[PDB]
Amino acid sequence: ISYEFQTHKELYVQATHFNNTILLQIRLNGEMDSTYEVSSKGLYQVVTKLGDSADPKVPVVCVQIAELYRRVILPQFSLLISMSSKIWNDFGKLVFVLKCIKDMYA
């Protein structure tokens, strides 16, 4: 099940739902280069698949996006994010991306 949205250096969003996970792309001028898994212990716990695993900006953006889902978008938890690291305003930015995710109903 696919949804996607594009807005404005341009930001592209796309998601793909499954029984076991979602899978979100956040592209910047078509670019995407990092991959984080934001799964929860049942009752959040980011893991870095490819990118800078020591950037402290990271788990913040992730856990934000993870809340935007878990408690505002639907309709034991697992998201996969792939994004342009080049995105990092900077709180102003995170707010834009998050409104872009809701503009395709996520």
């Binding site: 670019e31 280069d33 893991v47 870095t48 490819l50 990118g51 800078d52 695993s53 020591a54 342009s84 690291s85 080049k86």
Partner: protein, 189 residues
Amino acid sequence: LGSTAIGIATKEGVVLGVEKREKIVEIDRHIGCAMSTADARSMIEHARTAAVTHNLYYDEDINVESLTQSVCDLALRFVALLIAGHDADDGYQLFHAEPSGTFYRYNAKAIGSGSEGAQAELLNEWHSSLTLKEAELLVLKILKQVMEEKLDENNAQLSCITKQDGFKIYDNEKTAELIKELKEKEAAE
């Protein structure tokens, strides 16, 4: 039962040397690594992927510390490495990466079979003004010092990474000289 591998950082290149008895592999043009050895293909592949991705998107060398974080992370979510590189952040750098996924910085380091042996000799010979050629020779010396059989270009192997020539694995010639030159030089008295 891990095998010998030695690195010495200088202000003009880091030098990785091993007991040949394929153990030095390139991660990127500006970063090699030497290892103690088929459980590695995945870490190496990962490393390379990280390096190339960063490079493609940024059009620059990846930060050797970031690279070593990336490979250690992989183990952290559960084999022993000497990663050596030059970057424009902290110039020449040398790291030791344990199967545990903990890593530390060093300026000289030995891992494998004669590695408590060698690390002492490293400790009281390393200093921050050593030239690349001194370091080259120094590594060769420690390697003869600990090796099972004799030291010829066939059972030990040298490499280095430098700001200008990126990574390099020395062929048997360059190394044939150096081992002969360590012979002449340690015959002064």
